[PDB]
Structure formats: C-alpha cells, structure tokens
Design a protein around this ligand. Structure first.
Ligand SMILES: Cc1ncc(C[n+]2csc(CCOP(=O)(O)OP(=O)(O)O)c2C)c(N)n1
Ligand code: SF4
Ligand code: SF4
Ligand code: SF4
Ligand SMILES: [Mg+2]
Lengths: 83, 170, 402, 291
C-alpha cells in the first residue's frame, strides 16, 4: 500500500535481484587469494560478502558481473566466466 | 496492424533495432511506428523496444502488450524475463542463441526460431553488434519486411552481409 | 495532423528530431538549452546542428539552469533575436516566475514543451500537469496530436507570437516520450517554404545604443491594470491569428492542423469526447470502432488551450447529448482537470444544459489503453441516457494500493 | 572493511561510479547520519518506490535544493535538541552541485551550517543521457557538446568548484577519487567531524557516459590522477595543507585514449593540437599544486 509520504523501508532494494543483469560472472580462485580484501571494497553492488575465515564469497543474487573485482585483484584470484 | 517487441540489455541498442525496423517497413510502403520502453537505460539491465506496422497511418499511442512477433537479442534474458508473454498463438519468437528452438523450452504456442547472430556478428563484422543482424533473421522468419529494405536502412543510417547471413540461417 | 496523401514525401525520424529540425528551419538567433527527460533529444539534436555549423546567425547556450534558459531568451528577445528553447516538468516549474515576466514584457519567445509529470513523487513520464499549471502565465499554449503537428507547430507559433497584434511568448506542447521518443513517418519542415511563410522577426523597439530605450519599467496602480488588459487583448487577437496561420500553413504546405479546435465525427455525435494532445490519436481509433458499430461517438480536440476558444467550443458542443472531458492533470482540491473546469465554465451561461463529466487519467504516464477509453465511453453513454452518477473521477486508480 | 550503509538491488549500471562514491561516503560517515540527495543517477537508481537502497535516513526534494534542504535538517535537529553527533550530509552530482544547485549551496556555506557536502563528479549530467555540465572538461564530447564539423566538443574548461567553496570560507575542502577508496573514506570522515560547512569533491568515472567497460571504473579513476588531470589535495581554512604527489606522471593520451568521449581527438584533423591543450592543463596542475 502507498503510505502518506510515501516513505520507504531501509535496504528494501533487496527485493530486486540484479544477478539477472549478468553477461559474465566472477568466480573466486581461492588458492590464489591473499585475503587483501580489495574485492569487497570495490564492488558497486555490495555483492562481495566477508567470511570468518577471512576469504570472501559472492552474492550471485545481486552481482551484475561488471568485473571490477576481477580487474582490481592484485593476485588474479578472480576469473570472469560467461553467464 | 502488426506489433513487435524487442528484448535486450542496456547498451545493446534495442531502440536502434526498433527504429531500423520502422524505417525498413516504410521503405516497403508500410506505415510504421517505433519507440523504446519509456525510462532510463542502465547498462546490463533488461530493456524493451517496440515497432508497429500498418497499411494505414498509425495514430495509436498506447503501449504494446500483445505482440505478433518478439525478438530476443540476448539469450540470458530468458532466465529473468517472460519473453513469450502476451504473444498471439500464431506468432513468432526469434532468439539470438547457439541452441536450437526446442532446447530452450518456452511455454508458448508460438513458433520459436533461433540464430547464432552473435557468431555471425563476430565473424563478419568483428564486433558483437547483434541489434541490426537480428533484423535479417526477423525478415527471414516473418516475411513482414523485405531484407533488402533492412539493408538499405542500416547503410542509410550508417553489416549488410551479416544481415544477409542471419536471413539465411534463420 | 499527418496527411496520408503526403506518403511519398515522408521520412521516418524521431519526434525530437523532427521538432529540432523544424526549430532550425525556423531560423532562431538564440537557442538556450537545459537538459531534462524527456526533452533531451530535442536539444541534443540542436547542439549537433550547431556542432556541424548548420544554423547561421545563431548562438546556442548550454546554461546552468532552466531559470537561466528562459532568462537568457528574455535578454536575447529584447535585442531583437528570434528565440527558442525546449523544456518540461520540473524545468518548466522552475521557470514559472520568468514565464509571467516574459509574457508581461510582451516578448515572443517560443518553447517546445515535452509534457511530463511533476514531483512529488518524482516521475519522468507523460502528464500535462507541467504546462497546465502555467495557465495564468500569459503564454500561448497549443497542444499537438502527432509528430507532424508538433514539428509544424514551431513555425506556426513563431508566426503567431511575433505578430504585432499578439507579441506573447508561446508553448508548443507535445507528449513526453509518446511524441518525443517515437519514430514515425513525417514530412520534415521545408526550408524555402518556411522562408516565405515565416517573416524574419522585425521588432519596432529593441536594445540598441544608437536608439536607447528602457524595457521592464515599474508600474504603479495607475497603469498596471492597463498592461494586464492589453495582455488579455493580445490573447483575444491570437484567437483569429491561430485560425489564420493554420489556414495559411495549409495553403503553403498542404498540411491542415485545424486551428483552435478540431472535430472528429463531431457533427452528429451524441457522446462527445474532449481532449488535448497525442491522446486524440488513440481516441480516433476507438471512435472508428464505435462508428463501425453505428454508435454516434465523436471527438472535440482542443488545440489552443491559451487562448481558450470559448465561443468555438460552445458552438461545437451545441448538438451533443453528453460530453466527457479527459484531462491529464488535476487541480488538487477540486478533483477536476482544467479542461473540464473551463469547459463547464464556458458552457454555464449558455442555453445548452447537457451533462458534462470529467475523467482525469494518464497521471505519471499511466498508459491510456483502448479498453480504458471504451470503459469511459460506455459510462458516458449511460450518462446521456440516465444522468450523472459521478461528476469527476480518476479513470484508473488501483484500489489495492488505496 | 568498514561497514557501508547502501544495499544491493539498486539500478546502477554495471560498474557504477555513483554507487561506489556513495558507498565510500557512507563507510567514512558511519550510521549516525542523515543524507540529503538531489535528483540524479544516484537518487533515481537507489529509490524506486517502494524500495530504497539506503540503510540510513535519506531525503530527496528537488534537483536544485541540496544545500537548503540540508540546512533545514541541521536547523531542525538543533531546534528539537536532537543534533548530538548526527552527521548531516548532502550528496549530489556535478550538475546538481556546480550548476543548478550552486545558489542553494552558497547560501548554506555562507550561513555556516554544520553540514558536509559530497560532490560526485562524473563530468556530465548522466541520468538525463550525458549532457554537458560545468563539470565537463575541455574537449569532452557530450550529447549537448558533440564533436562536429566545427566543434571539438565542450569548449569550456572545468569549473573549479573546490576553489569556489574555499572562497566561501569553508574550513575544510578536499578533492578525492573513487580510484582511491581509503583516501575518500578518510576525507569524508574528517569532513563530517569538523563543525561547519565542509566540501568533498570526488572524481567518479562513468563507464556509460565516458564510454569505457564497466570493469575499468577504478582503473580510469587512477589514470586521471596519474596523468595529473585530477589533483588530489586538502584545503584547511583556505590553505592547501596536503597534496598527493605524482612522481611518475603519465601523458594525458593514456587517459584520453581509454574513453569514447575523447575518441574524436584521435580521428579529427587538429586532434593532436587539442590533446596538447589538455596536456597543458595537466602541466598547469603539476605547477600550481606542486605535484
Ligand atoms: C529544475 C530541474 N531541471 C532539470 C532536471 C533534470 N535532471 C534531473 S537529474 C539531471 C542530471 C543530474 O546530473 P548530475 O547532478 O551530474 O548527476 P548524475 O546523474 O551525473 O550522477 C537532470 C538534468 C530536474 N530534475 N530539475
Ligand atoms: S582482491 Fe583478490 S586477493 Fe584480495 S581478497 Fe579479493 S580475491 Fe582475494
Ligand atoms: S563482478 Fe562487479 S558486481 Fe559482481 S562482485 Fe565483482 S565488482 Fe561486484
Ligand atoms: S550512467 Fe554512470 S552514474 Fe548513471 S547509473 Fe550508469 S554508471 Fe552510474
Ligand atoms: Mg554528473
């Protein structure tokens, strides 16, 4: 329903999965990862999630496959694959 | 009146396809109309464009909801977009894909037809510009517009061989 | 509107292209530009023409606001330049104060308006609220139905505005997206024809060091009324001017845009639909369907909104059994669109007491389908037979959202 | 990584510069903040009703009124005794900041409101389809300053907004870039913490508008700094106190070549001469800022 405003709830864009925008998809090569954390910083779509072990993982629900993380990785620990 | 819906992603020039279709149809002596889905085009985002064909001037100003023909520029769109939505039973869906029609499995009564298009583009043009090449496939699949008129349009505004191959392959 | 007989002369281009082309061919001396969806293609096209050196005796200004867009044209017009811009929506709203100023300065500035809804909430789609909200500013307002009309409207409105008996600025209104972003067959404006149709702007008094004069003086209560009276008088003069220029255009170009108002199957209509702009196209198709089934439905298109063609409308509605007025706007607090309000007002003191009802629709670009038009016609048919149930209403509210 | 307060699901292009700039801003500012966001890509892409990407309070009024709206927020917090350590932050594009919103901003700075203002400078009006703003650099092609038979694109230099805001007596003015995330976060954080009107000008390469692949947004940003076309510095009370030195500066061609909006300088007759004018701008930067 339209509220008097109309005010929106915070973080409600989660309802919009943008993973369907991808032509290419990033894939972590965990063996090559230095855990520097650059990929989490550089993601425009907050689709790089931290882990307790200090590695990172993708939220493919939202990843738009722009390839910035892959481009900025100093370890070439991310590969872009078609899809 | 015939109605055409084109599916693509921001940056893939779906509006140009719609425009070229309306230009080519008019060269054939059919009254035409073309327009983007009204909004802001985001790179990578699913987008739509539209064309109408008629023997008489087109005065209708509503959106297109039930197309006779559908063109899908990017196969990956099938996962998130209902491209067969609203299509007439005697309609045709043209899809840019390596796979053959039946492999795609779309819940529709309309004829599903496929061309690689992307490969045709990389082979002949060099770049993966599929918005114009798929129009060749459209002409071959539907017979609604002469393929020569589509060539005429693309050369006028600015490829023709890539249009020609797609016309054969469909 | 478009003449099918002209098929061999037509080309398929974007509406914005046709309008930009028409502006160029109309030979402005100063173009000002501020971008806003969905007006952008017009000014982009003009800037490309400038970049290719296609417009002689002309300067183009990329300003920093719409306020400056119109304000530059005030300065330029007063020097003697033919002036042009295009705007919409938030842009037109920002100009509000300068709109009053320009009309009061009696400067024949022309702008295309690519009608779009107004904030809040922000919305980039078609609605007539932007221009309708300017109905007091003293600008001419004409509403085009198609691309042909929208482009042709540019030279026409220059000729009207610049006429010595008028000297009022004017808006050539066309539906945002619907007309601005569509590609359709159109006859592009002819240069040599326009050079003969549209005389060069030759103002009697300008800013000129060799003939110093003062423009924009301060009027006390002893003279202000007379300025306002003369603006009204200028609008009165624009009534026959709009008819004359439309007829003259028809004679020169072979394209008849119908002047102040335009009837479609109107003469014997039991139910008359009134509307402005591109919606008329959809209406014509629906009317044809009703006509095919022998139902006496017709359209009265209002082309000139300012000046308001009261006498013309009154005469045109004389045989109707019921009138339905469609507005792409609403005066919040009245539940009525401006055309509905003004139609009733012009009909009030006449002997004709037929029911007139209103629907507001196309708010924030909400599509007007053939089926919605059919629903509205059916409701009005009932009114013709049985009387008014609801005088004014939103045609298509979603009660689920409340 | 510091927490950001922007959610996934926004409609930014793949590799969006506006998304990055706002993300870094929030990381520096923290959650005790209220954001004022004039019309533009950032606003449109994050707030399609009924959805919002913002995890902090956020208000959008109009295109022109960022400065004034932020002023009213700050004043209301003071009046109602709710100011505390809340950061009132305006975030807007080059067009909103430098062009249509400059009166609003001038008034807010002059009055000395405790606000922070962040300019996201992608050197054109992007949401509307890439039109020239005063943020547009010399000889950039835009849809209202296209290359043509008699045009090399935008004929004007970039307006110097940091200098303009310094002249307003702003206690803290800093340039930054999405190419240097940590730098941006640090500068934003500092700007928010100073009591008074502070200004951050962030360079933000737009893949859609500049014409480069979405994967290169950060790379292009770094290249702007390395060619010395974008000086990175801080001004405290109108005096430059810090500058990011560039020992190994790159010729401007390397930056210009990577972008469709400059392609015309490589195809048109006299293009190399125009490139020289841009090189001269970079050389001036080196001299003036002490790079
Ligand atoms: C008064 C007014 N004029 C024009 C517009 C149209 N408009 C909305 S956003 C925008 C461009 C925004 O450019 P910028 O501020 O640089 O942000 P960007 O989209 O580049 O991030 C324009 C021209 C408007 N909304 N209001
Ligand atoms: S940027 Fe590369 S090395 Fe660093 S954490 Fe991410 S994947 Fe690992
Ligand atoms: S590809 Fe782009 S959107 Fe996806 S995780 Fe990497 S940076 Fe984020
Ligand atoms: S045009 Fe540029 S700023 Fe706008 S959404 Fe796309 S990448 Fe972001
Ligand atoms: Mg910008």
């Amino acid at each position: 329903a339209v509220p008097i405003g109309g005010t929106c709830e915070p973080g409600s864009t989660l309802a919009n999965k943008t993973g369907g925008w991808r032509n290419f998809r990033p894939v972590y090569i965990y063996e090559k990862c230095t855990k520097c954390g650059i990929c989490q910083i550089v993601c425009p779509d907050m689709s790089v999630l931290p882990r307790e072990d200090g590695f990172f993982e993708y939220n493919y629900d939202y990843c738009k496959g722009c390839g910035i993380c892959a481009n900025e990785c100093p370890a070439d620990a991310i590969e872009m694959i078609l899809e | 009146m015939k109605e055409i819906r084109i599916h693509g992603r921001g940056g893939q020039g779906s509006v140009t396809a719609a425009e070229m279709l309306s230009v080519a149809a008019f060269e054939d002596g059919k009254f035409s109309q073309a327009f983007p889905a009204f909004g802001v085009e985001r790179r990578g985002a699913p987008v739509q464009a539209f064309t109408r064909l008629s023997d008489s001037p087109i005065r209708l100003r509503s959106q297109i909801y039930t197309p006779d023909y559908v063109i899908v520029q990017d196969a990956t769109l099938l996962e998130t977009v209902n491209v067969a939505s609203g299509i007439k039973d005697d309609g045709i869906i043209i899809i840019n894909t390596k796979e053959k029609p039946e492999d795609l499995k779309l819940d529709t009564k309309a004829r599903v037809m496929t061309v690689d298009a992307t490969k045709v583009a990389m082979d002949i043009i060099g770049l993966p510009i599929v918005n114009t090449v798929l129009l060749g496939a459209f002409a071959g699949a539907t017979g609604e517009i002469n393929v020569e008129s589509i060539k005429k349009a693309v050369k006028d505004r600015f490829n023709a061989q890539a249009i020609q191959k797609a016309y054969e392959l469909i | 509107p478009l003449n099918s007989a002209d098929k061999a002369k037509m080309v398929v281009v974007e509406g914005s292209y046709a309008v930009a082309h028409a502006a160029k061919v109309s030979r402005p001396n100063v173009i000002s530009a501020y971008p806003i969806t969905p007006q952008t293609h017009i000014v982009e096209d003009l800037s490309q023409f400038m970049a290719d050196g296609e417009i002689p005796n002309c300067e183009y200004i990329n300003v920093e606001s719409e306020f400056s867009a119109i304000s530059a044209l005030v300065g330029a017009s007063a020097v003697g330049a033919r002036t042009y811009s295009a705007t919409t929506s938030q842009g037109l709203l920002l100009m509000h104060e300068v709109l009053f100023n320009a009309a009061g300065m009696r400067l024949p500035i022309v702008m295309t308006v690519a009608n779009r809804a107004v904030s809040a909430p922000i919305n980039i789609w078609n609605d007539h609220q932007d221009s309708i909200a300017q109905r007091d500013t003293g600008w001419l307002q004409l509403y085009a139905e198609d691309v042909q009309e929208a482009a042709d409207m540019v030279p026409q409105i220059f000729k009207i505005a610049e006429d010595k008996d008028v000297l009022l600025p004017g808006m050539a209104c066309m539906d945002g997206f619907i007309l601005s972003h569509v590609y359709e067959p159109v006859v592009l404006l002819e240069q040599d024809l326009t050079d003969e149709f549209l005389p060069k702007y030759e103002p009697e008094y300008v800013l000129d060091p060799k003939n110093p004069l003062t423009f924009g003086a301060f009027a006390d209560p002893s003279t202000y009324t007379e300025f306002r009276y003369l603006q009204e008088k200028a609008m009165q003069a624009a009534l026959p001017k709009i008819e004359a220029v439309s007829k003259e255009f028809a004679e020169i170009y072979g394209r008849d845009h119908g002047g102040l108002i335009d009837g479609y199957q109107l003469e014997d209509a039991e139910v008359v639909i009134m509307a402005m702009g591109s919606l008329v196209g959809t209406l014509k198709d629906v009317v044809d369907r009703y006509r095919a089934k022998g139902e006496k439905i017709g359209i009265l298109k209002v082309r000139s909104f300012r000046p308001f063609p009261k006498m013309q409308i009154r005469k045109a509605l004389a045989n109707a059994n019921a009138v339905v007025v469609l507005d792409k706007n609403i005066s919040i607090g009245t539940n009525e669109g401006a055309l509905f309000t003004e139609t009733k007002a012009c009909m009030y003191n006449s002997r004709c007491d037929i029911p007139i009802i209103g629907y507001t629709l196309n708010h924030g670009g909400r599509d007007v389908s053939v089926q919605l038009v059919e629903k509205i016609i059916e409701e009005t048919k009932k009114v013709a037979k049985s009387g008014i149930t609801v005088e004014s209403q939103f045609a298509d509210v979603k009660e689920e959202l409340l | 990584a510091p927490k950001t307060y922007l959610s996934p699901g926004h409609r930014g292009c793949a590799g969006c510069c506006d998304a990055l700039a706002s993300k870094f801003m929030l990381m520096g500012a923290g959650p005790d903040t209220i954001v004022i966001n004039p019309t533009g890509c950032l606003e449109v892409m994050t707030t399609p009703f009924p959805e919002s990407a913002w995890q902090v309070p956020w208000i959008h009024s109009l295109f022109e009124n960022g400065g004034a709206v932020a002023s009213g927020v700050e004043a209301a917090l003071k009046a109602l005794g709710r100011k505390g350590n809340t950061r009132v932050i305006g975030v807007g594009g080059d067009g909103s900041t430098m062009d249509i919103g400059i009166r609003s901003l001038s008034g807010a700075f002059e009055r000395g409101h405790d606000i922070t203002y962040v300019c996201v400078d992608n050197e054109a009006y992007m949401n509307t389809g890439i039109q020239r703003s005063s943020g547009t650099p010399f000889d950039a092609s835009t849809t209202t300053s296209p290359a043509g038979k008699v045009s090399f694109g935008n004929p004007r230099p970039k307006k110097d907004m940091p200098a303009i805001m310094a002249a307003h007596g702003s206690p803290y003015v800093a340039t930054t870039s999405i190419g240097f995330p940590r730098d941006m976060m640090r500068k934003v954080k500092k700007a928010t913490e100073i009591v008074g009107p502070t200004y951050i000008h962030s360079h933000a390469p737009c893949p859609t508008g500049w014409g480069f692949d979405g994967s290169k947004t950060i790379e292009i940003a770094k290249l702007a700094v390395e060619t010395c076309l974008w000086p990175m510095y801080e001004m405290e009370n109108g005096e430059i106190t810090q500058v990011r030195k560039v020992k190994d500066s790159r010729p401007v061609e390397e930056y210009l070549r990577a972008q469709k909006r400059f392609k015309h300088l490589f195809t048109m007759e006299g293009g190399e001469e125009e490139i020289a004018k841009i090189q001269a701008a970079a050389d001036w930067n080196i001299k003036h800022y002490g790079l």
